[PDB]
Amino acid sequence: GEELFTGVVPILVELDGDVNGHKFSVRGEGEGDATNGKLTLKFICTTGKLPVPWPTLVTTLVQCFSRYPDHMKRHDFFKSAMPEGYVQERTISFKDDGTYKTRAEVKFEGDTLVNRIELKGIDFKEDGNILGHKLEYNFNSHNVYITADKQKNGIKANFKIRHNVEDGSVQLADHYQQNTPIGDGPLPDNHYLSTQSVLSKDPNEKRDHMVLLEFVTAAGIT
Amino acid sequence: GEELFTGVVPILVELDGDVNGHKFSVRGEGEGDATNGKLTLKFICTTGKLPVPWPTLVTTLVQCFSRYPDHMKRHDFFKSAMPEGYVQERTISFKDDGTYKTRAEVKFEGDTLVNRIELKGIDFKEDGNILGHKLEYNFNSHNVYITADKQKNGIKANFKIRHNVEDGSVQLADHYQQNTPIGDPVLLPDNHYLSTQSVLSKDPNEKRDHMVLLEFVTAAGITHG
Ligand SMILES: *c1ccc(O)c2ncccc12
Ligand SMILES: *c1ccc(O)c2ncccc12
Ligand SMILES: [Cs+]
Ligand SMILES: [Cs+]
Ligand SMILES: [Cs+]
Ligand SMILES: [Cs+]
Ligand SMILES: [Cs+]
Ligand SMILES: [Cs+]
Ligand SMILES: [Cs+]
Ligand SMILES: [Cs+]
Ligand SMILES: [Cs+]
């Protein structure tokens, strides 16, 4: 599938979410360069104010843009499932707080890469770090370990994401990730990805938004 | 002094370190844009394989290229020391491990911003996160609290750097930083903070132990202003 990702590919992300009843929608437009492992996107909240902090939606808001080095091309599941695409289902548990439950489809629609997502956050408490909006405008992770699930013909990943809290503490986010191809065609070994995220604001944007620049690279101590 | 950083300024970094007896040198070339708070550099180890993981040297490998907002220009200590420059002394205590001790001079040689540092690390353990090289190739986002030292006509800062470890844990690096002008008039700031976001990458066309660093630093904390 590593064919349609040479050159720059336009990205559209659509998310419809519901956290504790608070229903919202986010639309992100941009473009990705898998050759350089580069993502340049801009998300806005189409419905109004975002009920959760932007960093909390980073993991949910296209791993098919990660740069796989030429000697690790056998590890690329994300590209392989294209243009048929894959389904990314996730469960994100926030320590001492609520839980995100996401289901998304990442596929090629025309010559534009699309990530369409349904999100259901429940049992979220306040003050907290999510509903109370006390997470800083940044993002830290790594390194994410991807395994193959040959029993479902997809991949499984489990990782811990630490969100920096404004007081100086740390908000834990346990990600349990499952990916399963839509079509049939394409099974990687134990490898890790290395995305690096930087968050900013559009000075000419008076709405709720997040400008995301990202650097994803595949690597492996094997 | 701030008018020296309008536009793109070339940057030369030179780091000479000694960790547990292991001597090493790092040479960095790049350019910085203080208006956008952008910072592009490339560091190489000219003495061979780096004895320490790259992330631990990022904090020591030029805060005069940070983006200060229009209303906080009067609180920009770093640019006001230019072109004569400033001295930046640091003690970095790694929790349950050794300690870096650094002293740097950041000044304008010709039309080039040069950071010449001296590093000495002691009491590091071999099977630890640093000498055992257990740290992941990244760098977390941070918020530094910059305060004014009116007794040294300079500034003070103390912060916590979290380096990611391979086993899914965190290696804490406690930084103690003090910046002093030469004397020689400098702007002493009010209580404010810097926000830092870095990205480390490699050059595939380099066969030497290196680090390609991209960095975005912005200033905030003062209410208008
Ligand atoms: C997805 C998007 C951005 C990140 O920084 C990231 N880190 C770790 C795992 C997944 C992921
Ligand atoms: C210097 C460079 C990059 C960083 O991320 C950083 N963080 C905190 C203090 C200093 C510093
Ligand atoms: Cs743009
Ligand atoms: Cs939970
Ligand atoms: Cs499951
Ligand atoms: Cs040499
Ligand atoms: Cs290293
Ligand atoms: Cs120590
Ligand atoms: Cs980062
Ligand atoms: Cs001191
Ligand atoms: Cs002096």
Swiss-Prot record, chain A:
Keywords: Chromophore, Luminescence, Photoprotein. Changing N143K: Increases fluorescence at warmer temperatures such as 37 degrees Celsius. In Esmerald; leads to brighter fluorescence. In VisGreen; leads to brighter fluorescence. This is Green fluorescent protein. Energy-transfer acceptor. Its role is to transduce the blue chemiluminescence of the protein aequorin into green fluorescent light by energy transfer. Fluoresces in vivo upon receiving energy from the Ca(2+)-activated photoprotein aequorin. Changing S141P: Increases fluorescence at warmer temperatures such as 37 degrees Celsius. Belongs to the GFP family. Changing K73R: In Topaz; shifts the major emission and exitation peak up to 20 nm. InterPro entries: GFP (IPR009017), GFP-related (IPR011584), Green_fluorescent_prot (IPR000786). Contains a chromophore consisting of modified amino acid residues. Maturation of the chromophore requires nothing other than molecular oxygen. The keyword Ribonucleoprotein does not apply. Changing V216R: In Azurite; shifts the excitation and emission spectra to shorter wavelengths and increases quantum yields compared to BFP. Green fluorescent protein has been engineered to produce a vast number of variously colored mutants, fusion proteins, and biosensors. Further generation of mutants led to more stable proteins (at 37 degrees Celsius for example) with brighter fluorescence and longer fluorescence lifetimes. Monomer. It comes from Aequorea victoria (Water jellyfish). Changing T195 to H/W/F: Results in significantly red-shifted excitation and emission maxima.
